[PDB]
Structure formats: structure tokens, C-alpha cells
Symmetry: D2
Subunit: 399 residues, 4 copies
């Protein structure tokens, strides 16, 4: 365990090895951590647990900190298995202990653990739980940030916001605090997290932060459920989220494609050359989706004013990894971004139009598509470079 | 080089290392080979080249066999880069050498190599090229088996059918002939090849084989462009293709899914238990698409009377790898097969219906979907097992 | 659960998804299963549990079969986590239940579970446990097949040998019995298992099987801890093990290497051509260790009369993946096999001699090494082919 | 092509897709590029070519820039295939063109291309080649930075140092200059490159840089063979190399291991906790070698004052991936670093001592090893944490 502040004790778990979250949909190249907190005032409160894979360790470690029967209340901000995953093993030892959570969390907790007999206590925004010594917890519902069950818990006096997933990041380090870790790595992990997980809930971010601030509660620390506790200039992460939620983009274009014989790759490289020659302000990145980290592609899309996506025609349809990434983007809801589809074909083609239609349906504002037959010769590569120049001109930011 | 028969010399390339074809769409776990043949009669004829990656070796090796200027004719059955990939380097040495190919192959050859000045000679089915000593080549067009440019070349007297991709397989071995290799491995590779590449052209297979047989030409050997030369009971591969083309299926069900927290996996396992208990005749296979070889999944689909496909709901859409595999299956055109969609959701769901509609559009005859919320408890697992029992009963073959 | 025979009930777990065992040292491309058996006579006996990852399911499923308090005895044949992994969760419900195991298993069980207070009962070979109705269990110690704690348990009357890891295989199927599954796949998985895991204990295999047979106990079934129950001609797997233990080899040579710029790959391919031309009886396989399944390489080594291993020189040492595989082979103890080291270098070299010395130390009988500088030209490739011809002649089996 | 300065034209190749160099020994997660330069004064000089995979493109692109017959001289700084890989295709068009290179480069060029008839001109340090308009090239031999053939070429007047591999990095971007790319990414790639490739030649770095500076030649730009041209404060990369060569280390400890059942992982995590609690100045990183990027582990080792390496005992030897990484480290020659070996065992063990001996032989100054049996309980984890505390105290930097 590690002291957070006063009588707040981090009793979580670092996970150096973990490389896959949500099946294989989110790759954690710097591992992760699962933060749980024990507050010891007149009442003893446990905030969240840890991933199910560490259930045994979590309960044994908690015993080393406190006799389990001395825990008064358990707060579950969110019932995804990376936070409530040790709850069944803990509850087996202290079956009657009250659990405080949102109404939706009863559904999600029962959904995973199947113990509807536990003593649940529904909390709504503004509800309070007194823990003594002039301190209390104030609950704030945050539905769809990022699950229906989600909430945050604020501790008065100590002025700590327990934000669960919000403001967190998958970044394993033995140091608990934000000022103690490498800043470049920290912020890279924060942005990858927002881009890949929170983008579709962006419309909910500014209203919820606005609501919380209107409570006029001081924030000395933000203790999230993943990665660092924000204790040096904690509002920095809040301000980033406000920037990130507003249909964020930089002067940046991302190009990604799949290819069977490199023809669409040659088109992509020519497009990039045309962009770079025409508007040097623009940062350009190119990825082969079959050979690159998918989450890195999506973080780039999030950061970009526009994208070009490429596929050849394969059995009259799109290449499968491109079809999958377009499905995924549809669910992520990127906004205010432009796109252009491109690709090669051997005879009747069709995949480029099929792709451009799905990109439009995903919310991208479409420019003209670029098509070529078989392998582009010198003449065709010139047309590909010009497509890049024309896309750069059309998408250029104001001087 | 290796003697095929009489004056036919294999001058190809074995590829022990290759693991990816068509980008990463076809995984060659036993490597591959690229067969090219040099026939030396009164005229010298080269049939096909090899993959572009071995262009230097191919030309140097061919020089070891024959002075390049002594080659009279070049036959290109098919211009995909794994067979015509060394053509530019060869043609640079002997620029005026005549090339015999289909009309469509002029387009595809020019498409890849950009030398429209080469001396192309269009051949149609039944056209002949005399090479002396009472032998000649007879060309047979085979459009869309598997490209518009595809054809086969038959050599009279020696009675050898050069079938290019047809009847071939990706299976690297130093032994050239079918009777010289491991039979289980050979036939596994043949079926994986047909299932993953030729399924969508199945309707063309029986008419083309019927046409070729109606020529009343003896076949002593079938010399393909990948893997073994069929010289012991060569019609065995032809008969397999006739079986494979007729909307082939065995008494077999394939279950595949993706999952973020294992809920859909639990459903899949319960379904399988219900099937196995109800109809023991049925071979059942289960795959997590995020953790398994995709081509092996598709070979199983090809072999199956039906499939169950599973996904959870992720950001109101399907899991991406499932969306991609459904796109791919749509292009493959499986026929006479049944399906049932299944999966878990947390709140409003939607992915199962989205999946079932796309499976129907891909040609599967749909049975009822199976849905569950969060993690299935004992009661829900019973419903999943019963879904399996009911699917087994509905899809059962006649006693 | 599934009936094995009479009152023996399979209460295990199928694992369709698992792809890695022992870290990543053993890849299970066809999944696996964990077999546990409940015998219900006058006494109720549980034989083994399942992998720790399925602990919750195992106990819940066992409850569906029997009230936990009705279990009289628990037999633990082997305490590796894939079999005793659910023991802590089970013992928490029935703390006083007697456990029967070898002396060494007390050490290994306490080693993993840390409950030395459990009621252990040491069994030695020939000890018996009466379970009523004229049936009893007879224990047979099998130390280092494959752990110090290992044993088998034989059930009289029903004539079932519970062999735990021995005779098992990682092969997931819903059908329990050997006659119900695909035979090619079954035997492939059995051999991969023996080659990769049991080879170093081969010297113990023939004496232990000899001892068991000398008991004159009928064997109607062999119920292992992984994969199928052998009930049709069960001695078939026993006879295979006797063949496999006797320093098994076929007329087969395996070539494997790593390479930075393909020079050692070119040497390997030339060597193979020389072998194939010289002794057509020999099955040859070639693997790039950086691009191939390591367990498949080792299964081939096991099946081979000899191996050639290749590395270039990298920073005055061997390429790392080759150093690792030689370490692993040293621990596996291959016997009666021949080897030859080969590779390329740029200047002073040294890796080939370094490799040949380690192969000798691993137990291989060494033939001359083959060395080349940079990329082999035509002359050097001739020398590589001749090395193959000479190796084939030297290692040839009798006519 | 892109203008570098005055009459110097970049005529290289960007490689967005490439992910593997030197087999799979160096992973390029941000791609790479191959820089070649054409200088057009009174004489026309080509400096280097590009990777063999882009040979066709390179020659076609060069034709677009200049008639091949107008090239006067070719300079080959280094004959590895990523730079001289297009030389055979270029030389086929202009066979008589003089090549300037080191004596050793004749051996390496002939080694790869097998055209000893080409007109080679040996250059030694200080030799000059006049190209007119008051400019000339001055050659500087740099043997073993990083091959025997390596050299740099300096262009007077324009004051550009063509350093080939030295000062380069694998970092693909359409922008050519150092001030035009993301600085964090650039410097990350520079350090990964030095750590993984140049560490063993560190002793040669300070003398060669000292020699070059003693020439009193102004340096306006450093045009390397990979990544950016250094044109803004170009000496920044030179100063980094001087820091990196001096047995570089930060206040940082790297822990890495392999594990079959997570016991050694538990030890590693406890060790890390002890370090972090004892000396908060120290940055700690932990990697499972079977699940992490190997080059990232080695970059961390390079940056570290010490390492702890972990393995269990497997068949009386070390786990193979650990044996391979120790072989690789032996060749890399890390200096002034401390180490401690650790790991778990089941019975007789031996792998930890085996590992500690090899680490000592690799140049690490050894502290005591840490050993545990099976899975560490609470008592054993305390000993592991204390090992961490004791290692932190011993290795602490001065206050
Ligand atoms: C397996 C396969 C299936 C194909 N199916 C089609 C098709 O249905 N329609 C078409 O016009 N071209 C088809 N082609 C041709 C490719 O689209 C053509 O080779 C294209 O130039 C490839 O571009 P790429 O190298 O970027 O993949 C197919 C090619 C392959 C290898
Ligand atoms: C990233 C993510 C996004 C989700 N989006 C939705 C959604 O849009 N609608 C819904 O009903 N459930 C959604 N869920 C809930 C899952 O569908 C629910 O956890 C389900 O039981 C998971 O099944 P699985 O373990 O097989 O993946 C989401 C879950 C995650 C982790
Ligand atoms: C990173 C690296 C390190 C090398 N170290 C050595 C060395 O220490 N001694 C030597 O003689 N050659 C060394 N070489 C040269 C290679 O051994 C030479 O290129 C060889 O032909 C490569 O064979 P391969 O393509 O099979 O890897 C090295 C090459 C590279 C790329
Ligand atoms: C395949 C295998 C081989 C083993 N060989 C040995 C051995 O030779 N000597 C020994 O003392 N323990 C041996 N063991 C036991 C392990 O060292 C023991 O389980 C250890 O605690 C594993 O540590 P880990 O989880 O970090 O891999 C072996 C274990 C396995 C699975
Ligand atoms: C069980 As109590 C009275 O310590 O909350
Ligand atoms: C060029 As000729 C006459 O040998 O075909
Ligand atoms: C606890 As009993 C008497 O059923 O073995
Ligand atoms: C061939 As010249 C005279 O242009 O160097
Ligand atoms: Fe108040
Ligand atoms: Fe005739
Ligand atoms: Fe008796
Ligand atoms: Fe001068």
C-alpha cells in the first residue's frame, strides 16, 4: 500500500505484463494498473477493487492493511471487471457489507457477479455518505462516461476526486503521482486512452465537467482508477479532456490502407508526397493496417483534420481489415473530419466506392475518391501525387 | 532443375520461409513453391516464371539450364506476381521473345510490368502452338479461375496439363511428385487453398472441367504452378475439385466469435455442449477470431453444414474482427449453409441483429439468434445449451 | 459432466481458446482440456481438478453433480497448476477432506497453495484405497514423469488407469473418447506433446511401463488429464510411448537457422537440394526460427536422424534465437542424433564454431561444419549443395 | 527528389511499412528511410543507393532526376544491403562508372553483388575527389562504425558531412530536416538505434569524432543514410553520441524475466516495490521477455545503472528466451553496469546460478542472486522486497 494523502491509502495493483484489454481491441504497450483506495476516518471505506486476475492478491493485501470486518462501506464507481473483478472474493469474507453504487451499477454488478442478495445502496448525484471527522463522500453520476453504471466519488476536506476511468491512463509505474513519472509517456498514454475509448462519449464530457465545477468543490487531487494520481496541477488533465472533447484535431492527415500486392501502398506513398510538397505545415502519417498497431492508427485519426483510407478490391468487396476498422470507426463517432477513399483494382473493382459510402456513413465529410488499375506506372503515380496536392489545398487551414 | 517427364524440366523455386500471401489474407504455414517449366523439343518453351522476390535467382538458374537466346516461346498462363514476377528481368535479356497468353493477360501483364511493346500473341481455347517432334501445346482459357487472365496449357504426346493455380497447393517440399510427399499434409494444404481462394468461383469449376474432359485428351500428369506435380493417379485432384465445387459440406458445425470479457465465449462453449449432447455425429470446432488462424476458420466454414457466429455489442456496433470476417465471407460466396448469430450485451445491444442481417446477405440461411445480457449465470447457460440442442435438431442430416 | 464408464464421471473443462502453455514455451494450436473425474461407489472420490483459470466454473459445475460435503477423498496425481489449480477454491468449501498424493506432492501442493494444514495422506506405489462395491484405487508413483510429484491411480474392477499427463495430448474436442475424434489430429497432438515435454524423461518411460504391466492389471481405459479418454484399443498409446522413448528417429533431416540478410537461408536451401538429390528416402524440412512455430521445429528434431543448424555471426556471437533453441535442446536431451553447424560471416566470424561446440555438448554427434563469407555466389552454392550430398551419404540408413 | 542544399539532391526512399531489420533482431516501429544523395557540380556524384527491395523504384526515380550516363562518380560509404542494395541494377545500366569506397568495401561489395569487374577506387582517410566549382569530397574511414567497410564523405564549401549509418535513426517522415519532425519521436528513435546497434563499438566513437573535429572542417549539415538531415544545430547529435559512448547510464534499473507459471514474475514485482520504496530517485521498468518488445528492453538496459534478470529452471537449464537475450547482451558489450540474477525452481534448480555466471561473463558486475522455491508466499515475498531494498541501497548514486 501507498499513502495518497492523510488517511487515504492506495491498495491497488500494478500490472507490468498486461498487453491486451477488451479482448485484443486495446493494446497496452506500457502495461496498466488498477487503483483501489481505502479511506480510514471514523468509518472505513473501500473505493473500487481491481482486475479479476488479481483477486487473490487483492484480498490478501487488503488483509495486510486492515481486518476485513473493519471495513464499513464499499463504493463501486463502475462495475467493469478491471475494477469490480475482486468483489466476489471480498464479499465472500464480508457478505453483509453495504455497497454504494448507481442504480445502473446494481444491474451491472449483478450482471457479472450474480449475488443480488448483497446489500446495495443506490446513490444519485449529490447524495452524501458521512465518514466522520468532518469528512464525507459526495457522489456524482456520470452515465456513459463510459458505461451506464459509471460515477465519481468526491471526498470533502481532503478534496480528492475519485474519478474511476475518467482522466486515467494505461501506464504502469511504481511511482503513484503524476509529477513522479516521465511526462511524455504519461501524456501519450492519456491521449491513446481518450482517442480509443472515450471519443464516442465526447458530447457528454463538457456538460459533466461543467456540472462538477459548478459544485464549487476544491480539487487538491484526482485519484483515477488507472495509472497516476494527479496531485501536481491536477486540473491539467481536466483541461486536456475539454480540448479533446471538442471534436479535437491538429493540422495532421493520417493515411491508412491494406494491400495484397502493394499497388494501394504505392498510391498511398504518392499521395503523401503530394501533401508534403504542397502544405509543409501538415504532419502526415501512413499505416498499413495489416502490419501496424491499430490503436496507434486510431489515435492518429483522432488527432487528424482528415484521413485517406485505401483498399484494393478483393472478391468484389473491401479488404477485411479495412471493413473491420470502418465498423470500429463508425462506433467511435469521429466528428468534423474529412476523408477520401482510394485503392487499386484488377477488372471491375467496386471496393473504393463501397468504402467511401461507409466512411460517409461514419460521419466523415467526403472528398473525391482516387482509383487506379493494377500497378500504377509513372503516369498514374503523377495522378496520385496530384490527388495529394489537391487534398492538401482543399483541407488547408487558414494562413 | 528437375526432370518432370522426357524433355520437360522443372525450373521453379521452393519457398520454405514464406508465411503470408495476398498481404496477410492467406497464411502459408507450410511455405509454398512457384513452378515454372522448360520444354525442350524442336522449339524451346518456357511455361510461367516465379515470384518477383526470386527474380534474380530465377534468371541465373535458367541460364544454368539453357542459353536465354535459345528460348523460342514464353507461355504466361496467369500474370499474378507469384508467377509472372520474374518476367521483366527475363524480358530485359531477351526483349523480342514472343509471349503467348490470353487477351485479358495482355491487360494484366501490362498492368504489372508496363512493357506494352513486348510481342504478345493472344491465344483462345483450342489454339495450338507446334513445338516439333509431333508435339504441340493446346491452350484452354479459364477466366475467373481465378483471374480474368487465367488459362491452362496442355502438351500433347507427353500428355501433361499445365494448370497453373488450379489443382495446386501451398506446400513446400524438395520432392516434386505427389506420391513422394506426406499425403495428409498435401491434402490439408489442397483443401485450405480451395476453401480460402476458389470458393467464390465454384460455379465455374464443373463447367470448365467438363469442357476439358470433352476434349478427349489423355492426362498422364497435372503440373500446377504451386506444390506437387500430380503424376500418380492425377485425376484424384480433379475429382476432389468436383466434390469441392458442389457447395461442399460435411456433418460439421463451426462456431466462431470475438469477445471483450469472455461472455460471448461462455455462450459459445454452452452452445457446443448442447450440440455434442444432441447429435454426436456432428464434428464441432470453436474459434476465437482474435486468437486463431483466420484461414483455418474459413476452411472449417467451407467444410461445415452451418455456422454460429458471435459478437458482443461494442459502441453500438459489432466487434471489428467479426465485421471484417463477415465482409470477407460475403466475397467468398458460401452456399447451402445455415447460420445463427449470438452474443452478449450490456444495455441496449444491437450487434447480434446487425450480424444476423449481414450473414443473411452473405448467403446463409438464418435460424433464430441467441442473446444474453452481461455474463450468463446458470439459468442463462442452460438457455445457451438448449440453443445448441435446438440448432443440432434443426440442422440434423437424415438418419 | 459426461459418463466415462459405470460410476466414473468426467467433470473436467474444455479449453478451446488456450494457445500458450508454460509461458509461451508450448503453443497449443488446437487448444487443450483439463480432465478431472468423480467416481461414485460406496465412497465418492474426486481425481484431480482443473486449470486455475477455470476454478470458479469447476466448483460450480461440481456442485451441480454432487453436494461438496459428500466427497470422501480427493486424489491429486500431480500438482501443476493445470490440474490442481482449482484446489484452493474447492478446499475452502470442504477444508477437512483428505487428500491422497505422493510425498513430493505435499511439497508441490504446499508450494503453490500454501495450506500445509490440509489433511494430506502420502501414498507409495502399491498402496490401496478402498471405495466399496469390491473396487479400490491402487497408486503408482511416477517421479519425473514429468515432475517429482507425479503418480497414476488405477481403479480395479472398472479397470481404468488415471494416468494424468502421461499418454495425454493438448487437443480440444467435445467428444471424450479416442474413437470419436479425428485420428490424424489426435496423433499429431500426441507426438508434439511427447517430443516437446517428455523427451528428456525418455529413460524413465520404459522401466515405468514395464513395472505397471508386471502388475498384471487389466486396462479397459486410460483416462488421462488432457484430451481424450483411451477406450478403443487403449494400449495403442502405450505402444507409441515405448517406440517414442527408445531414442526415436525416422529417415528424416531437419534444417533450421536464423539469418539477418538471407545468406544463411541460401546455404540452407542449397544443403536441402543436395540431400534430396542424393538420398530420396529422406524427408527434409527447413525452418527459419524467427518465422516458424518453435514447437513444430522441435517435433521435427525429435522425429529426425540428424539436424543442420545455421546462424550468421552477429557482434562476435550467435544469433540470439539460435542460442535460445540450443539451450532448450540441451535441456530436452535428444539422443542418437547427428548434427552439422553452418552459417555465413562478414569478416572474422566465429558463430559457427561456437554453435557446433554447443550442439556437441547437447548430445549431438557432430559432422563437419559449413562456412561461407557474405552472400554465396554460384561457386559457393555448389559447395553448399555438395555439403548436403556428403551429409546425406554419411547419415544414410542401411539399404 | 528533395533539395538538401544548393546542388545536393536527396534521391532516397521512405519506407513507412518496414517493421523488421536484421532478420527480426531490430524492430522499426516507426518505419525507416534510406537516404541517397546526388550532387551536381562540374562532376555529378551519387552518394549511396537504397535498400534492395526498392531497387526498381530507385533507378527509375534517378532517371527522372538525371540521365544515368551523366553520373561521373559513385560513392559507396557502406555496402550493407539497405544502402548498396540497388547497386547491381544501377551498374547494369552504367557498367563502367567508377566506384569510390574503402578497401574493405571492395570485399563487402563483391561479397553481396559478385561483380569484381566493376571499377573500384580505394579511398583512405584524407583522400580527396574534386567535383569542380571549388568543391571536393574528403573521405574519412570509420572501420567498425559499424562494419569494416564503413566510411563518411565530407563535401567542402557546402560543408555537408555524409555520415551514412552514424547519427541516423529509423524514423519515417515525409519531411527531410531535423527541425521539421516531432522532436520526442526523433530522439527516441536515435537512442533505440544507438543502444541496439552501436553499443558494442562505443570505444571507437570518441576517437573517431575527435579525429574528425581535428580536421577543422565546418559542418553546416549532417546528411545520414537513415532518417533526417541534421541542419538545425547539427552538432546536437554528435554531442549525444559522445555522451552515449561513455558507458552511458541514468539513475534507472531494468528488470526482465521469463516465467512459466508466474512465480518469477511475482518475485520481479516484489523486487520493484522494494527498490521504489527505498530510492525514489530510481526509474524502474519491468518486462516479461516473452511478451514485450526486445529492442525496448535493450534500450532500457543501455539507459540503466543496473539490471535484474529472472528465469525459472526448465529441464535443468535456463528458459530459452533468457538464454538468447544473454547471448545477445554478451555481443553488445554493456559496460559499467551492475546485475543480480533471480528466479524460482521446483526441486534441484540451477538456472539462476547458470544465468548469474553468464551475466558476469557478459561484463556485468554481479550482486547476490535471489532464489525462491515454487510460488512465493507472504514470507518469501517479504524476502523478495528486501532484496529490492538491498539492491537499491547498494547501487544508489551519491546524494
Ligand atoms: C484474391 C484476389 C481477389 C481479387 N478480386 C478482385 C475483384 O473482385 N475485382 C477486381 O476488379 N479485382 C480483383 N482483384 C485484383 C486486385 O484488385 C488487383 O490486383 C489490385 O491491383 C490489387 O491492389 P493491391 O496490390 O493494393 O492489393 C483480386 C485480386 C486478388 C489477389
Ligand atoms: C468498450 C465497450 C463498449 C461497449 N458498448 C456497448 C454498447 O454500445 N451497447 C451495449 O449494450 N453494451 C455495450 N458494452 C457492454 C458489453 O456488450 C457487455 O459487457 C457484454 O456482456 C460483453 O460481452 P463479451 O464479454 O462477450 O464481449 C460495451 C462494453 C465495452 C467494454
Ligand atoms: C548487426 C550485424 C553484426 C555483425 N557482426 C559480425 C561479426 O561480429 N563478425 C563477422 O564476421 N560478421 C559480422 N556481421 C556480418 C554478417 O555475419 C554477414 O553479413 C553475414 O553474411 C550475414 O549472414 P546472414 O544473412 O545469414 O545473416 C554482422 C552483421 C550485422 C548486420
Ligand atoms: C516444463 C518444466 C520443466 C521444469 N524443470 C525443472 C527442473 O529441471 N528443475 C527444477 O528444480 N524445477 C523444474 N521445473 C519447476 C519450475 O522451476 C517451478 O515450477 C518454478 O516455480 C516455476 O517458476 P516460474 O513460474 O517463474 O516459471 C520445471 C517446470 C516445468 C513446467
Ligand atoms: C460490520 As461493521 C459494525 O464493523 O460495519
Ligand atoms: C531468337 As530464336 C530464332 O532462337 O527464337
Ligand atoms: C465428511 As464425509 C463423513 O461425507 O467424508
Ligand atoms: C561516362 As562520363 C565521361 O559522363 O563520366
Ligand atoms: Fe457541510
Ligand atoms: Fe494432330
Ligand atoms: Fe483383492
Ligand atoms: Fe584547398
Amino acid at each position: 500500500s501507498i499513502v495518497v494523502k492523510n488517511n487515504i491509502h492506495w491498495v491497488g495493483q500494478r500490472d507490468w505484463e498486461v498487453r491486451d484489454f477488451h479482448g485484443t481491441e486495446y493494446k497496452t504497450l506500457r502495461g496498466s494498473s488498477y487503483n483501489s483506495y481505502l479511506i480510514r476516518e471514523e468509518k472505513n471505506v473501500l473505493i473500487d477493487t481491481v482486475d479479476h486476475k488479481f483477486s487473490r492478491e487483492f484480498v490478501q493485501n487488503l488483509r495486510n492493511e486492515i481486518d476485513l470486518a473493519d471495513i464499513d462501506y464499499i463504493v463501486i464507481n463502475h462495475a467493469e471487471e478491471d475494477h469490480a473483478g475482486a468483489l466476489t472474493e471480498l464479499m465472500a469474507q464480508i457478505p453483509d457489507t453495504p455497497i454504494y453504487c448507481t442504480a445502473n451499477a446494481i444491474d451491472s454488478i449483478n450482471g457479472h457477479h450474480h449475488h443480488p442478495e448483497w446489500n446495495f445502496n443506490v446513490v444519485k448525484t449529490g447524495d452524501t455518505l458521512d465518514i466522520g471527522n468532518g469528512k464525507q463522500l459526495i457522489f456524482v453520476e456520470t452515465p456513459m462516461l463510459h458505461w451506464p453504471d459509471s460515477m465519481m466519488t468526491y471526498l470533502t476536506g481532503d478534496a480528492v476526486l475519485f474519478s474511476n476511468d475518467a482522466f486515467g491512463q494505461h501506464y504502469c509505474d511504481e511511482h503513484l503521482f503524476n509529477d513522479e513519472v516521465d511526462q511524455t509517456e504519461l501524456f501519450e498514454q492519456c491521449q491513446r486512452y481518450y482517442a480509443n475509448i472515450l471519443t464516442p462519449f465526447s458530447r457528454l464530457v463538457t456538460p459533466k465537467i461543467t456540472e462538477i465545477l459548478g459544485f464549487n468543490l476544491p480539487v487538491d487531487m484526482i485519484a483515477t482508477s488507472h495509472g497516476v494520481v494527479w496531485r501536481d496541477n491536477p486540473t491539467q488533465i481536466v483541461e486536456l479532456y475539454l480540448k479533446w472533447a471538442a471534436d479535437y484535431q491538429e493540422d495532421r492527415i493520417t493515411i491508412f490502407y491494406d494491400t495484397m500486392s502493394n499497388n494501394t501502398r504505392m498510391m498511398a506513398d504518392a499521395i503523401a508526397q503530394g501533401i508534403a510538397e504542397t502544405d509543409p505545415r501538415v504532419a502526415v502519417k501512413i499505416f498499413n493496417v495489416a502490419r501496424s498497431d491499430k490503436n496507434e492508427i486510431l489515435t492518429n485519426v483522432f488527432r487528424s483534420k482528415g484521413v485517406l483510407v485505401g483498399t484494393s478490391t478483393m472478391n468484389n468487396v473491401m479488404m477485411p481489415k479495412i471493413a473491420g476498422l470502418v465498423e470500429e470507426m463508425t462506433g467511435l463517432r469521429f466528428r468534423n473530419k474529412r476523408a477520401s477513399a482510394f485503392g487499386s483494382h484488377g477488372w471491375s473493382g467496386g471496393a473504393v466506392d463501397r468504402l467511401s459510402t461507409r466512411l460517409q456513413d461514419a460521419g466523415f465529410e467526403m472528398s473525391l475518391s482516387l482509383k487506379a488499375k493494377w500497378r500504377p506506372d509513372q503516369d498514374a503515380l503523377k495522378l496520385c501525387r496530384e490527388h495529394g496536392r489537391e487534398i492538401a489545398r482543399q483541407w488547408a487551414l487558414a494562413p
